[PDB]
Amino acid sequence: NPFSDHQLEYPVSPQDMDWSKLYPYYKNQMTKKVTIADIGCGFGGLMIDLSPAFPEDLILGMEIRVQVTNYVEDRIIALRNNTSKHGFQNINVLRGNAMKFLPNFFEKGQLSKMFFCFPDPHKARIITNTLLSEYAYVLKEGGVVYTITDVKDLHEWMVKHLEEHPLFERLSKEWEENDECVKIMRNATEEGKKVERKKGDKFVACFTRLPTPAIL
């Protein structure tokens, strides 16, 4: 019953995407896939910091504002230029609305990490468990959703729906405290550096994408 949305006769495939233009350095064919996604990345700070931490992972920021994504593109081109032969070659940005069906972008289980760093607290579609189900679809079993905000109400709203969904399980404080991504995530971004200035609080919460029960 509760997992019907995830045991599918006709699972979808992504639309055609020339990832080689975003990560030409892995053009043999394409050598890797995007495995880390920064949803609503803003000016790209998180990606910049994750880049060296995860030199083997391709990292993609998705940003709905074209002004910001046009800017971020010039920024990572600068970072590549001013840099060894692999520097910042594993990050790029994409103009897109993450609420418009992520399975158009990524294969099933493609991603190991999804970051929602200081999301703004329903034009294209209403926010629902269905959205979280689309996130679960593109997220590997064992993958993690990383969540941080200064807005207690947004924090509690995200937590409420993530724990309601049957494919997400909250990770402990201990897990968070020993995780390098939580550390980076806390102050990698302009909005995060803002909040500490305002003496604000940083509400973190992380979830594992549970394995889907087997159907056969």
Ligand X SMILES: C[S@@+](CC[C@H](N)C(=O)[O-])C[C@H]1O[C@@H](n2cnc3c(N)ncnc32)[C@H](O)[C@@H]1O
> Two tokens at 174?
């201990």
Judge residue 199's burial from the number of C-beta atoms within 10 Å of its C-beta, 0-12 exposed, 13-18 middle, 19 or more buried: exposed
Q: Please report, as a single letter, which amino acid is at residue 87.
A: G
Cα dihedral sign, 118-123-129-135:
negative
Cβ-based neighbours of 204, under 8 Å, separated by 6 or more: 147, 148, 176, 182, 185, 186
CB of 61 to ligand X, least distance (A): 8
Tell me: is residue 191 an annotated ligand-binding position. yes
By CB under 6 A, which span of 74-82, 151-159, 187-195, 206-214 interacts with ligand X? 187-195
Of the candidates 22, 37, 60, 62, which one interacts with ligand X according to CB under 6 A? Answer: 62
Residue 159 C-alpha from the chain's centroid: 16
Q: How many CB atoms lie within 10 A of CB 18?
A: 7
Euclidean distance between CA atoms 105 and 107, whole angstroms: 7
Tell me: is residue 41 an annotated ligand-binding position. no
**Which one, 43 or 168, has the nearer CB to ligand X?**
43
Euclidean distance between CA atoms 69 and 86, whole angstroms: 22
Site membership for ligand X, residue 59 (CB under 6 A): no
Site membership for ligand X, residue 192 (CB under 6 A): yes
Tell me: is residue 196 an annotated ligand-binding position. no
CB of 191 to ligand X, least distance (A): 3
Of the candidates 27, 65, 152, 173, which one interacts with ligand X according to CB under 6 A? Answer: 65
**Subset of residues 100 to 129 that bind ligand X, contact rule: CB under 6 A:** 117-120
CB of 214 to ligand X, least distance (A): 33
Of the candidates 171, 191, 206, 207, which one interacts with ligand X according to CB under 6 A? Answer: 191
Site membership for ligand X, residue 42 (CB under 6 A): yes
Q: Which residue out of 120, 150, 153, 179 is catalytically annotated?
A: 120
- Establish whether 120 is a catalytic residue: yes
Catalytic residues: 120
